[PDB]
Write a protein that binds this ligand. Structure first.
Ligand SMILES: *[Se]c1ccccc1C(=O)NCc1ccc(OC)nc1
Ligand SMILES: *[Se]c1ccccc1C(=O)NCc1ccc(OC)nc1
Ligand SMILES: [Zn+2]
Ligand SMILES: [Zn+2]
Lengths: 153, 153
C-alpha cells in the first residue's frame, strides 16, 4: 500500500490536511481528511498540473489532465484525472473529506504525487454548467488553499 | 528536460524558492535559488524521505536514503541520495543556492519529487564529525524551513 499527504494552506482562513492511500497499484485511492475555514456549501476540489506554489496556488496551473479530456465530475468518464468534484462545508466552516477515486493514482502516468491539491472558492458544476468555462474549470472560481501532494510514511 | 520546484517555509523568518532542472533522465540535476532569513554561515541542505509536512518539517522524517548508506557530503560515494551538503548565508541573511548533483534525480527510482527539501539550523559536517550522529544527520540540527518538491512547468 502507497500513502501520500497534502497540507492545504492559502492567504485566508482555509487550512486542511488530506490523506491518500492506495492498497493496490491498479486500485482505487481513498482520500480523507478535514478542511476548516470554508463558507457553507460546495467547494471545487481538484488536483492541478504543477506542484508549483512559487506565487501561491495560481502557480499550480490548470487541472491535471494527462489524457487531454474535458472537465467533468469524479463519476464521469469525460473528466480530467484531477477532477475530484466538490467538498461540502456546513455552517461550522468544516468539510469532512471522504472520497474513493478510481482515476487518480499514487503510481504510473495518473500519479498525483508532486502535483498540487486545490480547494476552490465556489462549487464545481462538474462540466454541466452550459458555458465554455464549465468544460475547463467547472466555474469553481479562485483558489482558497493548496498544497503539494507528498509521499507519506 | 524535467523541472521541479520547492517553496521553503517554516515557523520562523526563513523562506526560499529552490528550482531543479534535469536535461536528461540519467543526467545531473541543477539546483538553484535563494533562501532569506538565515544566520551567517553553513546550513545543512537535504532531501528528506517523506513529503509529509503534517506537523511541520519534523514530519519529513530522515534524509532520503533509498540505498541504505551512511550520511556524507555531495562529493562522497558514501552518502544518502538526499545529501546536498550545505548552503552558505552571508551577513545579509541570504544564501544564493547553485548546486549540480549527479545522485538526486527528477526521474527513476532516486527521484526527489514528492519528498521534502529542508534547510537546517547548523552546518552539516558531511559525516566527517567526531560522533555517531555525524554518520546519520551530519549534526545539522533542527529544521528551519522546508517544502515538498513539486513538478514544475
Ligand atoms: Se507516483 C510519482 C509521481 C511523481 C514522481 C515520483 C513518483 C513515484 O512514484 N516515485 C516515488 C515514490 C512514490 C511513492 C512511494 O511510496 C512509498 N515511494 C516512492
Ligand atoms: Se519522478 C518519478 C519517479 C518514479 C516514477 C515516475 C516519476 C515521474 O517523474 N513521473 C511524474 C512526472 C514528473 C515530471 C513530469 O514533467 C512533465 N511529468 C511527470
Ligand atoms: Zn477539471
Ligand atoms: Zn544524510
Amino acid at each position: 500500500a502507497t500513502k501520500a499527504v497534502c497540507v492545504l494552506k492559502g492567504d485566508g482562513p482555509v487550512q486542511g490536511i488530506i490523506n491518500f492511500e492506495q492498497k493496490e497499484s491498479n486500485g482505487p485511492v481513498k482520500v480523507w481528511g478535514s478542511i476548516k475555514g470554508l463558507t457553507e456549501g460546495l467547494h471545487g476540489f481538484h488536483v492541478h498540473e504543477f506542484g508549483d506554489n512559487t506565487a501561491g496556488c495560481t502557480s499550480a496551473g490548470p487541472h491535471f489532465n494527462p489524457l487531454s479530456r474535458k472537465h467533468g465530475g469524479p463519476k464521469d468518464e469525460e473528466r480530467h484525472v484531477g477532477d475530484l468534484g466538490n467538498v461540502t462545508a456546513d455552517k461550522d466552516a468544516v468539510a469532512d473529506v471522504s472520497i474513493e477515486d478510481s482515476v487518480i493514482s499514487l503510481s504510473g502516468d495518473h500519479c498525483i504525487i508532486g502535483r498540487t491539491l486545490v480547494v476552490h472558492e465556489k462549487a464545481d458544476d462538474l462540466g454541466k454548467g452550459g458555458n465554455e468555462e464549465s468544460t475547463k474549470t467547472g466555474n469553481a472560481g479562485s483558489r482558497l488553499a493548496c498544497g503539494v501532494i507528498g509521499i507519506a510514511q
